Amino acid sequence: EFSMKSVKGLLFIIASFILTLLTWMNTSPQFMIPGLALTSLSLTFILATRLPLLESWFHSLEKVYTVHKFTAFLSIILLIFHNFSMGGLWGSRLAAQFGNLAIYIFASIILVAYLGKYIQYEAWRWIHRLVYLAYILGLFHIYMIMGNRLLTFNLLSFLVGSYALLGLLAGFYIIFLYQKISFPYLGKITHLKRLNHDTREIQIHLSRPFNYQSGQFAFLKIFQEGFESAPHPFSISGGHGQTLYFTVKTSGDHTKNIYDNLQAGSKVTLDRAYGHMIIEEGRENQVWIAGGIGITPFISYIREHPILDKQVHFYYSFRGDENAVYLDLLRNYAQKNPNFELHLIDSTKDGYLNFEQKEVPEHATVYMCGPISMMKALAKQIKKQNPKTELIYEGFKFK
Ligand X SMILES: NC(=O)C1=CN([C@@H]2O[C@H](COP(=O)(O)OP(=O)(O)OC[C@H]3O[C@@H](n4cnc5c(N)ncnc54)[C@H](OP(=O)(O)O)[C@@H]3O)[C@@H](O)[C@H]2O)C=CC1
Ligand Y SMILES: Cc1cc2nc3c(=O)[nH]c(=O)nc-3n(C[C@H](O)[C@H](O)[C@H](O)COP(=O)(O)OP(=O)(O)OC[C@H]3O[C@@H](n4cnc5c(N)ncnc54)[C@H](O)[C@@H]3O)c2cc1C
50: left (phi over 0), alpha (psi -120 to 50) or beta: left
Q: Identify the residue among 203, 247, 300, 317 touching ligand X (CB under 6 A).
A: 317
How do strand 217-223 and strand 311-318 relate by DSSP bridges? unpaired
Question: 171 is in the binding site of which of ligand Y, ligand HEM, ligand X, none (Cβ under 5 to 8 A by kind)?
Answer: ligand HEM
Distance CA 218, CA 50 (A): 12
Contact between residue 132 and residue 102 where contact means Cβ atoms under 8 Å apart: no
Q: Which of the stretches 64-72, 151-159, 249-257, 381-389 binds ligand Y when contact is defined by CB under 6 A? A: 249-257
> Which of 253, 305, 258 shows the shortest CA–CA distance to 279?
305
User: How far is Cα 37 from Cα 371, in angstroms, rounded to an integer?
Assistant: 36
Which residues belong to the annotated binding site for NADH?
Answer: 249, 293, 317, 319, 347, 352, 369, 373, 394, 396
The region that residue 275 occupies, defined by phi over 0 for left and psi between -120 and 50 for alpha, beta otherwise, is left
Considering only the stretches 37-45, 208-216, 285-293, 365-373, report the one whose residues sit in contact with ligand HEM under the rule CB under 6 A.
Answer: 37-45
Among 168, 192, 230, 342, binds ligand Y (CB under 6 A): 230
Kindly state the smallest distance separating residue 382's Cβ from ligand X, in Å. Answer: 13
**Contacts with ligand HEM in 64-123 (CB under 6 A)?**
65, 68-69, 72, 75, 79, 82-83, 86-88, 91, 93, 95-96, 99-100, 102-103, 106, 110, 113-114
Distance CA 236, CA 220 (A): 10
- Selected binder of ligand X within 41, 201, 294, 330 (CB under 6 A): 294
Task: Identify the sign of the CA torsion 271, 277, 279, 280.
Answer: positive
Least distance to ligand Y, CB of residue 237, Å:
6
**Residue 292 engages ligand X in binding (rule: CB under 6 A):** yes
The answer to whether residue 157 forms part of the interface with ligand HEM (CB under 6 A) is: no
**Binding partner at 232 among ligand X, ligand HEM, ligand Y, none, C-beta below 5 to 8 Å by kind:** ligand Y
For residue 146, state whether it binds ligand HEM (rule: CB under 6 A).
yes
Task: By CB under 6 A, tell whether 196 contacts ligand X.
Answer: no
Q: Which is nearer to ligand HEM, 132 or 333 (CB)?
A: 132
Please give the Cα distance from 117 to 107 (Å, whole number). 17
DSSP H helices in 52-207: 52-57, 61-86, 94-114, 121-128, 131-145, 155-172, 178-181
Planar angle of CA 233, 239, 242, nearest 5 degrees: 95
**Residue 5 vs 319, nearer CB to ligand X:** 319
Binding mask 285-324 for ligand Y (x = CB under 6 A): --------x--x----------------------------
How far is residue 47's CA from residue 170's CA, in Å, rounded to a whole number? 8
Nearer to ligand Y, 90 or 398 (CB): 398
User: How many whole angstroms separate alpha carbon 302 and alpha carbon 328?
Assistant: 12
Is 395 a binding residue for ligand HEM by CB under 6 A? The answer is: no
* Helix locations, 173-290, DSSP H: 178-181, 253-261
Q: How far is the CB of 297 from ligand X (least distance, A)?
A: 9
Binding segment (CB under 6 A) for ligand X, from list 135-143, 158-166, 224-232, 285-293: 285-293
Q: Largest Cα–Cα distance of the chain, in whole Å?
A: 78
First to last CA, the chain: 16
Output the smallest distance, CB 399 to ligand X, in A.
13
The binding site consists of 31, 50, 65, 68, 82, 88, 93, 100, 120-121, 125, 128-129, 141, 231-233, 235, 247, 249, 251, 253-255, 293, 296, 317-319, 347, 352, 369, 373, 394, 396
* 35 belongs to the binding site for ligand X (CB under 6 A): no
Please return the burial class of 29, using the count of CB atoms within 10 Å of its CB with bins 0-12, 13-18 and 19+: exposed
As a whole number of angstroms, the distance between CA 158 and CA 140 comes to 17
C-alpha span between 386 and 287 (Å, rounded) = 13
**Number of shown-chain residues binding ligand Y (CB under 6 A):** 20
Binding-site member from 205, 232, 305, 358 for ligand Y (CB under 6 A): 232
Give yes or no for a contact between 218 and 236, defined as CB atoms under 8 angstroms apart.
yes
Residues near ligand X (CB under 6 A): 249, 251, 291-294, 317-319, 323, 347-348, 352-353, 369-374, 377, 394-396
The site for ligand Y (CB under 6 A) is made up of 121, 217, 230, 232-235, 247-249, 251-255, 293, 296, 396-398
